[PDB]
Amino acid sequence: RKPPKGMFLSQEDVEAVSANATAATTVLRQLDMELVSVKRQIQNIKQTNSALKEKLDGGIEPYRLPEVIQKCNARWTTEEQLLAVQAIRKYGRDFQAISDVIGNKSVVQVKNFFVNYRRRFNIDEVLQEWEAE
Amino acid sequence: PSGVEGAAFQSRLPHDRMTSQEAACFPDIISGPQQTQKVFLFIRNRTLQLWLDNPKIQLTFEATLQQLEAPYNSDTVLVHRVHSYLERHGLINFGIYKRIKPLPTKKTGKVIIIGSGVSGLAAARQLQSFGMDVTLLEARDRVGGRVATFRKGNYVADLGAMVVTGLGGNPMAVVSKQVNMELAKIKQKCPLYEANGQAVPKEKDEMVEQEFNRLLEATSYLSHQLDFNVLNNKPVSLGQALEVVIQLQEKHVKDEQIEHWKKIVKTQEELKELLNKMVNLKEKIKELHQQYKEASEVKPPRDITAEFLVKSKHRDLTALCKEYDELAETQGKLEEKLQELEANPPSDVYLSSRDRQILDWHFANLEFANATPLSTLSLKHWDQDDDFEFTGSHLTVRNGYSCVPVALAEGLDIKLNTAVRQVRYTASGCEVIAVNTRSTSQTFIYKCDAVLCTLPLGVLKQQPPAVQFVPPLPEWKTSAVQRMGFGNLNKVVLCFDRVFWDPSVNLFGHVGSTTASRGELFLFWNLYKAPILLALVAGEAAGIMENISDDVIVGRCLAILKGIFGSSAVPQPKETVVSRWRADPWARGSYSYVAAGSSGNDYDLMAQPITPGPSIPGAPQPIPRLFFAGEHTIRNYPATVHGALLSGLREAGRIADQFLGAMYTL
Ligand SMILES: Cc1cc2nc3c(=O)[nH]c(=O)nc-3n(C[C@H](O)[C@H](O)[C@H](O)COP(=O)(O)OP(=O)(O)OC[C@H]3O[C@@H](n4cnc5c(N)ncnc54)[C@H](O)[C@@H]3O)c2cc1C
Ligand SMILES: COc1cc2nc(NCCCN(C)C)nc(NC3CCN(Cc4ccccc4)CC3)c2cc1OC
Ligand SMILES: COc1cc2nc(NCCCN(C)C)nc(NC3CCN(Cc4ccccc4)CC3)c2cc1OC
Ligand SMILES: COc1cc2nc(NCCCN(C)C)nc(NC3CCN(Cc4ccccc4)CC3)c2cc1OC
Ligand SMILES: COc1cc2nc(NCCCN(C)C)nc(NC3CCN(Cc4ccccc4)CC3)c2cc1OC
Ligand SMILES: COc1cc2nc(NCCCN(C)C)nc(NC3CCN(Cc4ccccc4)CC3)c2cc1OC
Ligand code: NA
């Protein structure tokens, strides 16, 4: 019922090799075509990827900026409110970005802001302006 | 097994069942109740045992009955029917043994036996044993046929049969007790040596051998599991099945490389897309960092939109720097996943040239044993006799295997140098017309009741016929002769003045350069006390090498041997002999094989006797007149000495039943 271990003999494959006098070395030439063309395609993608690696040389170390570690604070300064309204206009509901810009307001505090001042800062009007982009 | 069960096994019989032959001689018993069957079996096994415990003397019915205990010796008719069935069919009182009851004074019936090889000798010796009158006609100037044994001074070497293939169930075990054969086990250890002279490393030898065995089980799988027995109209040979199996292994080696490198590209393409993402990210990061610089120009204290711009660009930039660091962790994973894949590629080939040559030696070995190229063997049936293999190590006859025929011929009427040319068989009897081999116009004519033909199958196949049948053999017989395979296998005997090889090694191989010459001088035996090396030619080589002169053949051998043991170690041989069995007109080959398109059923067709038509018309159907024996007639033990022997015993029993009647069947 089972071929010996490490022998491969499928109903289908057997029919394929035996069909003609040459169809044995047909099937096995077409697996050297397939093999040489995959080993070729690897050689391109290796040179291609080697070029792209040389473009990234330097990393991004020149362009990194220090991190602002400021602690959350309950009090909204008018500075902070004004930054908020602008961050909203730019970022929509991405409360995470908005909190990063303002730099001393947690994501909860932001969502709160969205409700407290909703009427006074016309946050609906500001959000539909963001959507329009 | 041991005891009375032992004796059954040792006589090729099931200890616990009645055989088909027993059923036909004892249908009263086998159709009857189970208990009488066990009695029958016990009596049979027990009598077999008595014979086997001492096959150097005749075993009489009186003696047998004397040594049965009750209840079994109560029924002395049964015991008599059994003892006689066994005697008749050569299960007991066969070979050379001291006769207790002297031979019937007046002989009954007359039989002519063609050929004094083992099948004929064994038959003759039984018919004579039964009081028939037997004469053997032999074309050669010696007995034994394909048991041929070279002798010169102290040199002794079989050019024919050489090996006793195990004593467990082998009738030659009995013969060995009766005749002085100096039997000697063959150490199965076989060093190979590649074309150059260099021992094959234990690493390879074991790897290729395992692969050989797997390839074989594979062929069996194709045959029995996938019904791969016929391709096109033609029947499939073991050889085709091996190419197919090999090609599929080669294929799978490729299929697995394709899939391995196909993983490398897919990963290499992931890394491509990742690097493009990473370059466009670096480029946006450069662009922002600029803009943050430009906006940080605008110095405090500044309006809130300009404050926003600075902070807004600063988060956006650190968001992309975060994202790029993520993408560059991924990059080092993909790059490690690819160092792994280039580290573990599957294997590069199925077999090197150096491997595929070692494999061809294994295939040569198989061609040697079947005495034919594997392209000729039936895939389906080449191994049909495997079920009957004997137990015990293989042995050689050391004083030379001729010792057996020659023994069997004691007391028989053998006409040597008598070549049968025509066999005539009619309702009233037979005439066999022979000539003197030496002086061929001198004619002889033998009249008899029956002819036992033991002509080798090669002879029976010869066109134009060497022996003519009158009337001609029927299509059913001639077609079987045509379908059956008759192979070929030669030996070169090298007689030296000194031993220069390993004496503890009975045999050793030589690997051929090419496939086409894989059977050529591929194996060497060291078996005799004298310093002799025997070298086989097998497969497609056996046939081709018959056209090449002895000196050239002996050359090619010494070459191979110098190449293995060094030019300063290998003398000239004192004596050489080179067999050519296909050329031999009394053999025309070595032994039969199950050719593709044939079956083991053809071996039975060969053994069926021939009944000629009636002389007077509307006269009752005669007796059969022409009987057949020889290695090609016994399907369970073809192509052997034991099988020939057995076929002879068979026919003797069958001829006796026919012309002396069978008292035991009532
Ligand atoms: C090289 C070789 C190695 C072998 N090795 C082994 C082995 O190792 N182990 C094993 O078990 N078996 C082996 N055998 C097989 C064994 O030799 C035979 O199967 C067996 O001996 C055949 O006996 P036979 O009586 O059937 O035929 P044969 O011995 O061939 O007897 C037939 C007789 O008929 C004679 N003859 C032919 N034409 C005529 C004619 N026209 N008139 C009168 N006589 C004629 C022949 O000369 C011969 O004497 C080997 C055979 C060969 C060739
Ligand atoms: C008359 O001389 C021989 C007859 C053999 N008959 C069988 N019959 C087996 C039943 C049918 N097959 C198709 C299953 N097997 C053998 N070797 C066996 C082959 C290898 N295995 C071990 C093995 C199997 C697979 C792969 C590697 C090793 C055990 C011995 C034989 C070896 C002989 O001489 C030498
Ligand atoms: C289905 O599995 C096997 C079946 C085999 N059947 C035979 N039959 C022999 C022909 C029987 N008649 C027709 C004569 N021979 C084999 N090997 C051969 C047996 C051993 N010899 C070498 C040898 C012979 C005698 C003494 C020492 C070595 C070569 C290979 C076989 C090996 C097998 O798997 C592996
Ligand atoms: C190392 O030497 C041998 C090992 C063997 N191992 C097995 N193992 C049994 C399972 C393996 N499969 C592949 C069969 N069977 C054998 N003979 C068999 C014993 C009984 N049968 C059944 C049978 C016997 C006679 C008539 C009809 C059927 C076949 C041979 C063997 C014979 C050997 O030396 C020769
Ligand atoms: C006809 O009945 C049997 C005969 C056997 N003859 C031999 N050897 C005679 C030749 C002597 N030399 C040349 C080898 N070896 C066997 N088994 C051996 C038992 C140990 N192993 C392992 C094994 C494990 C599990 C099952 C079977 C074998 C290999 C063969 C046999 C097993 C049989 O039952 C079937
Ligand atoms: C149908 O079932 C089987 C038949 C077998 N027939 C043989 N014939 C070769 C002649 C064996 N005796 C009678 C001489 N050998 C086998 N295995 C062999 C066991 C191990 N040897 C190598 C070896 C043995 C002893 C010492 C050193 C090496 C090779 C294959 C077999 C295994 C079988 O299935 C299980
Ligand atoms: Na004979």
mmCIF file of N, CA, C and O in Angstrom, chain A residues 26 41-42 72 85-86 91 94 100 113 128 133:
data_model
loop_
_atom_site.group_PDB
_atom_site.id
_atom_site.type_symbol
_atom_site.label_atom_id
_atom_site.label_comp_id
_atom_site.label_asym_id
_atom_site.label_seq_id
_atom_site.Cartn_x
_atom_site.Cartn_y
_atom_site.Cartn_z
ATOM 1 N N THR A 26 11.830 14.428 -21.463
ATOM 2 C CA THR A 26 11.019 15.662 -21.580
ATOM 3 C C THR A 26 10.723 16.259 -20.194
ATOM 4 O O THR A 26 11.152 17.375 -19.899
ATOM 5 N N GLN A 41 16.329 34.337 -11.803
ATOM 6 C CA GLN A 41 15.513 35.367 -11.201
ATOM 7 C C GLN A 41 16.004 35.772 -9.801
ATOM 8 O O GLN A 41 15.916 36.936 -9.427
ATOM 9 N N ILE A 42 16.536 34.820 -9.045
ATOM 10 C CA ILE A 42 17.219 35.112 -7.774
ATOM 11 C C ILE A 42 18.401 36.052 -7.954
ATOM 12 O O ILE A 42 18.592 36.938 -7.138
ATOM 13 N N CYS A 72 2.086 64.499 31.734
ATOM 14 C CA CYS A 72 0.693 64.958 31.574
ATOM 15 C C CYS A 72 0.331 65.969 32.647
ATOM 16 O O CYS A 72 0.924 65.993 33.716
ATOM 17 N N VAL A 85 -6.950 72.627 18.758
ATOM 18 C CA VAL A 85 -7.832 72.916 17.634
ATOM 19 C C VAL A 85 -7.121 72.743 16.293
ATOM 20 O O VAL A 85 -7.747 72.393 15.283
ATOM 21 N N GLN A 86 -5.823 73.005 16.265
ATOM 22 C CA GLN A 86 -5.087 72.902 15.010
ATOM 23 C C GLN A 86 -4.768 71.475 14.662
ATOM 24 O O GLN A 86 -4.845 71.096 13.481
ATOM 25 N N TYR A 91 -5.414 66.342 11.973
ATOM 26 C CA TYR A 91 -5.415 64.900 12.269
ATOM 27 C C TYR A 91 -6.752 64.184 12.433
ATOM 28 O O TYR A 91 -6.757 62.969 12.617
ATOM 29 N N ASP A 94 -7.604 61.169 15.258
ATOM 30 C CA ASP A 94 -6.408 60.444 15.722
ATOM 31 C C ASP A 94 -5.916 61.033 17.061
ATOM 32 O O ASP A 94 -4.898 61.735 17.134
ATOM 33 N N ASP A 100 0.284 63.698 21.143
ATOM 34 C CA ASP A 100 1.746 63.820 20.964
ATOM 35 C C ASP A 100 2.136 65.272 20.671
ATOM 36 O O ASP A 100 3.126 65.766 21.223
ATOM 37 N N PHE A 113 -11.669 66.931 26.040
ATOM 38 C CA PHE A 113 -11.592 68.192 25.303
ATOM 39 C C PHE A 113 -12.602 68.215 24.142
ATOM 40 O O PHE A 113 -13.398 69.166 24.019
ATOM 41 N N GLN A 128 -15.461 68.325 10.075
ATOM 42 C CA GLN A 128 -15.941 68.232 8.679
ATOM 43 C C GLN A 128 -15.004 68.882 7.667
ATOM 44 O O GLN A 128 -14.966 68.476 6.497
ATOM 45 N N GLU A 133 -10.779 67.058 3.258
ATOM 46 C CA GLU A 133 -9.438 66.762 2.666
ATOM 47 C C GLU A 133 -9.192 65.267 2.367
ATOM 48 O O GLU A 133 -8.902 64.473 3.259
#
